[PDB]
């Protein structure tokens, strides 16, 4: 085969509901199935197939290992995948590696699978290229080394990946790695607004540039926004200037007072956010998602803006549609791209967590929406699960 | 590969029982299986494989989501498929897209998957070519935009598809779309008898012509009959003239008084009907199916006529055989064609619904019959399910 | 690819235990599995893969459809297959066609699947070549038209198959069909001892000749023995002359008084028997199996003789080994051949039925033995099932 | 394709936790899964895929066949495999052959599968090349003929395999077989320290030499160490001289008094041990594993030494890390190698048995660790199973 490159995007001007993967529809006590207990789902596509990835707790519903299934980190956690369209069950899924933080991508020839493992103070990023484990990367701040929980991005064979290390409540200065046939050939140290960046959702703006919309878990409700030049291997981060704050929790739109870089208030905590590019011949669409509630992980709206500089443009993003109603859960979101025959189709995934607290099972559905045709986004998504079944 | 074209049909002069897919044979409380709760099954074949499609309620038997499983439209409904011959279970099936109305076909190179989604007043036809979502089509009468629930038909790369929009009890003027590598490149507006046409079962009479036997849900028990010329992309509809009324409910054969186009009575409601072509060197066989009961969805007989014009020929269709006994359920039927090495094999599928009303589970089996050898059709089909197990 | 031909057999001079497929090891009430309820299992191999076939009752254990699972013929019965080595479960299996009698073979290019269906007085042989149903054959004695329940045999593209029609207690004069790309191109009418022949187990003695060891269900305990010349398409049947009577029930060896063709006594009823060829450069081995008990379907021994004419040679077959102990069930047996890189490996399968009578479940295991190395056959086979679990 | 050869090893200088396969995470009474009851797991990799092998008792958890599931040898035991990364369940697994002792390898073209079967006094080694059973080998000491329970090793098409025969408590003089396209073309009789050698874990030191670290079950806690020259087909065994005794049970390191060959005390019983090669341009790493407890099968540490002669070098192996804590079970270990694009990645597997005694179920998890990056080994492995669920 040949190395993948970003192409121009397929025709269209709205997103529509594509696909729901709700594995706990079949998790009943009175049923006969074994859906895997997961969180942090994401999707990544190669020239022939799309894979649906997740981090499992190594437990099924129904079952007896519900306890600890609300934590993030433990020695059983694993990166798993099914072909997108298959329900992620005990039998359908393939286990790639131990991990409580994850990424994966296809370079045109082969899959790269990334998983972070180990103790909180000395955790370890691990790289699998196909079947072969091929490299690692050590914790540099000794406080929960971490990666994206969404697809990495490859071009001409170089796959690019955000990592971060630091306190969830303080400084977490991310870096980027450049990975080629599964080995780290370069380290990139961003400049600019670097205080706290984690869970970057990234994609290609062009053959020169990768961008990402990230999460500040401590300081601000504005998403940190990465521009990485892949020709010089240099990166700069600044906050998104829009009044449409995309993190949760957040304050009311436009109420953060100051120039583009101000923080200011109700910006502790956060959430991973969907972000995807619509690349046209003389114009670029940036697509984003965020929660319907300003405070809780309920609902998910889709927004878009075409062109401008997100670092300096304070104008609202344009509401396109409600993807998940306020009455339904809306936790992490991510972007990804499907390869049609001659163009790329942008999409946004949504993690819909079934949360009853730590004294029952904790898992998620996944809702997908993608650019298709014209007009407005038309229908919303429900998980359909009753957690007591 | 290369684009598919209709060929001449394989030798034979009767249909025989081929294959039963009865997934609820394994749906017992005392069993360990997970058959998917479906309705509107259909089959479509490519150069190497046949796929068995259906619309699932995203629920299994045994299980706890039986409620609402008798409705047609909801936000969980999905187009799903297995390789024909596999039982459609939670694990075997692949989920293609959200949908409460469906079609699919293979053009020789790739699969096209069609699914209609959304609210009743502003629903949305969605097209997937392989992995990529590639186009849509908007509701034009704002009353339950709908498609065939059977295979679309491709030639030299153009795949043809009926849609319809309108009141189930009044006007539903269908159109046809011409789809190529998953994008709509033409709209066809039929002329002639257009009042109410839905659930068209279509196939190729030749390299010039596609025909379809459709359902009038309001006005008549005669099936509306489409002739679509694929060289000029034009279509005309008239009612079938035969005394052998193929819809259910219906009145006694030959009792509709008038010329070929009269309606007249007990023609409210309806059912999707099987229809398939037997193409010979200097002759054409048209194969049809209909319910044994004149009023209820019980039984299914197979009929045939060779040549003539169905628009103007009032003569009876020739009873070939009882495919499902009166004592067994017989709901939707469809036609399809399997590719043998140098010729096409015509077939008819039969949806056999397990119906106990809305206070239990609602799903279906699928019975297949195909042209094979000579003589008479020999055996009938039972689902073998006891719904209380 | 290219057409298959029989080659010379791989080196060796004993059979050994190869493989047990015991699906009811996982059929417990306290388990979570769904093994298919089958009988008449058999195996057939192509250039790349071996398929394990069976006739299912369309019911699993554990489950609620045990009743009728001891009969042979009904409208739910089906030919099913898994890759040999896989457990035949609801999900693993593929359903080929409705059938209560079965055969299948691979010609080098594609699989041919055969299934007999229909009413007792007017039953129907059906042929599937790959996905396509391609031909049939009508009942000629109107009394349970039937086929082999073991592999058919192809050469240069012509696949040969025994069928039979007639009373299980009287005359059942078999014929042979010659099938090519799934269509019957010739009918062969054997001559000689033709009174009663059914369930023929066949294979190639050479590029000219096919032989078979069959069952007489009415008249004799000597197996009828077919020699079919594939160059002239002619066939002759005579009884096996050996004192080692291979049917069950039978009388003590050598106690049938008379020349080679005498019947005489305790020859009602019968059983399908294993038979396979070991083809060498200047010598031919014939391998056979039979039940340890003279009267009941308990145990299974393996015997061999090299060269001679089975029609006229009254000498004992040479006991090679006990494949199933007297304490274990031993019902049908069959022969088959696995393709190694440059030679064919002969094998014998054994159906081991779990029989508690008609008021519980009725299914089978399958035990395989094959030519491998030298010396004596070393171990026997148990199903390991407790039917009350 | 082409024959496999050992290449130089991929860059790195530590092992890290790669992958846990814990099938009994889903074996609960309150679950819906069917993990196969196994022991003696091992892994073997070909140019495109890695297979995870094991010997099953032909029983699942949950289920009713727990009794006898703590013995080694019986007539139901089988060699089974899944693609590495898949959970070994009733449905996922493929059954290769009857066996209570096992090996397998890929020569670059095809898989060779080895299984020992039969009675204790006259057991039988059986070889399958692809689908074809192709050879055997007879018991030469009439006391539990046995093989490695780990991967065999192929080069230029010749695959090399240890076997052994003799009392578990006395003499068990092993030999090596040279197998090519599945037939034994040579027998190798080692010289030197031959009293007791079994369960050899082997790999290539080079294109000339294969080495193995074996088990003495009777006489000593020093692992017997095989050097086999593949150019002359000759082999010599001596004990490992290191003070770091690798068997269990064992005495305290360095406490066996004498020259390199002394036995002396607490050397009855034993365990199969992990061993794998790191081949560099001018240097060789030998990697080993052993149990944390000196007496019980609890924990598992990883050790390494670079260069020297293991026969004569008494120096300690270098502790690299704790792979399994003392509080967790640690039974058999093995080495294997994954093929990256241009180099080989060394790995060690660990069998973690769930042992509650013979009055419940007896099975195992499998933990994998592999050379990846630099620094120290960072995290340990737990099965996470509660055997009462
Ligand atoms: C990252 O860089 C990529 C490489 O630069 C870029 O890929 C290009 O994308 C554009 C989309 O705007 C495509 O241009 C379109 O071309 C089609 C017709 O396609 C045929 O013509 C092109 C060349 O025409 C143009 O370029 C030449 C110089 O190369 C000029 O002289 C001329 O002025 C034209 O503007 C030809 O190269 C194509 O060949 C490719 O595609 C075919 C079929 O798809 C393949 O079979 C073949 O292997 C090869 O890949 C093709 O025959 C036209 O209808 C449109 O109007 C438009 O001009 C290019 O095809 C494409 N180039 C290549 C080399 O693939 C990515 O878009 C860019 N990504 C991003 C996100 O910026
Ligand atoms: C839609 O249009 C299709 C294209 O027009 C049409 O396909 C044709 O179907 C007919 C069935 O009646 C086939 O004709 C049959 O031919 C076989 C022997 O096959 C060989 O001969 C043909 C050509 O012979 C005829 O046509 C030529 C002009 O083309 C005349 O001079 C002459 O008078 C003959 O009547 C040859 O083209 C075939 O080649 C095809 O098939 C081979 C093997 O199958 C392939 O390897 C090859 O790639 C190619 O596809 C072949 O060598 C004869 O025994 C029969 O009696 C009959 O005459 C045609 O093969 C076929 N044509 C093509 C180009 O495929 C579809 O039937 C039509 N569909 C419908 C529903 O109407
Ligand atoms: C059904 O008929 C088949 C065709 O007649 C027959 O197949 C033959 O089986 C015999 C087994 O005894 C094989 O003969 C063996 O040959 C190997 C070395 O193989 C190479 O040599 C042969 C030809 O040698 C003989 O024949 C020629 C005339 O053809 C004579 O002059 C000469 O005296 C020899 O006796 C050659 O054809 C082979 O080529 C085949 O095999 C190779 C590799 O396997 C393939 O790559 C190739 O495509 C082709 O298939 C080969 O190069 C020798 O070591 C043995 O001692 C033995 O003589 C034949 O190979 C084989 N013939 C063919 C054409 O395949 C079946 O056995 C028969 N079946 C039964 C049950 O009777
Ligand atoms: C078992 O034996 C194997 C065969 O002897 C041996 O394989 C060799 O392993 C070494 C690792 O040290 C490789 O050498 C490395 O080469 C790369 C660049 O690769 C290219 O160059 C080599 C030849 O260069 C050397 O040898 C020639 C004589 O052959 C000398 O004149 C010269 O002084 C050099 O030292 C060339 O053969 C390679 O071609 C192979 O690889 C390519 C791509 O991988 C394939 O496409 C091709 O089919 C072929 O397999 C290649 O173009 C260099 O960067 C390193 O510094 C190092 O020198 C060899 O490639 C490799 N040889 C072969 C024939 O594969 C195994 O290592 C040995 N195993 C063990 C455990 O001992
Ligand atoms: Ca925040
Ligand atoms: Ca009507
Ligand atoms: Ca008899
Ligand atoms: Ca010892």
Short mmCIF file of C-alpha atoms and ligand atoms in Angstrom, two decimals, chain B residues 215-223 247-250 266-271, ligand 6:
data_model
loop_
_atom_site.label_atom_id
_atom_site.label_comp_id
_atom_site.label_asym_id
_atom_site.label_seq_id
_atom_site.Cartn_x
_atom_site.Cartn_y
_atom_site.Cartn_z
CA UNK B 215 -48.30 -1.21 -2.42
CA UNK B 216 -51.30 1.15 -2.37
CA UNK B 217 -52.13 1.51 1.31
CA UNK B 218 -55.31 3.54 0.82
CA UNK B 219 -57.14 3.12 -2.47
CA UNK B 220 -56.88 -0.33 -4.05
CA UNK B 221 -55.84 -3.94 -3.74
CA UNK B 222 -54.20 -3.94 -7.20
CA UNK B 223 -50.47 -3.48 -6.92
CA UNK B 247 -52.32 -6.97 -1.84
CA UNK B 248 -53.85 -7.82 1.57
CA UNK B 249 -56.45 -7.07 2.48
CA UNK B 250 -58.23 -7.68 -0.81
CA UNK B 266 -61.72 -3.21 0.14
CA UNK B 267 -58.36 -1.70 -0.81
CA UNK B 268 -57.39 0.15 2.40
CA UNK B 269 -54.28 -1.08 4.17
CA UNK B 270 -51.81 -3.28 2.32
CA UNK B 271 -48.61 -5.23 2.40
CA1 LIG E 6 -54.36 -1.61 -0.29
#
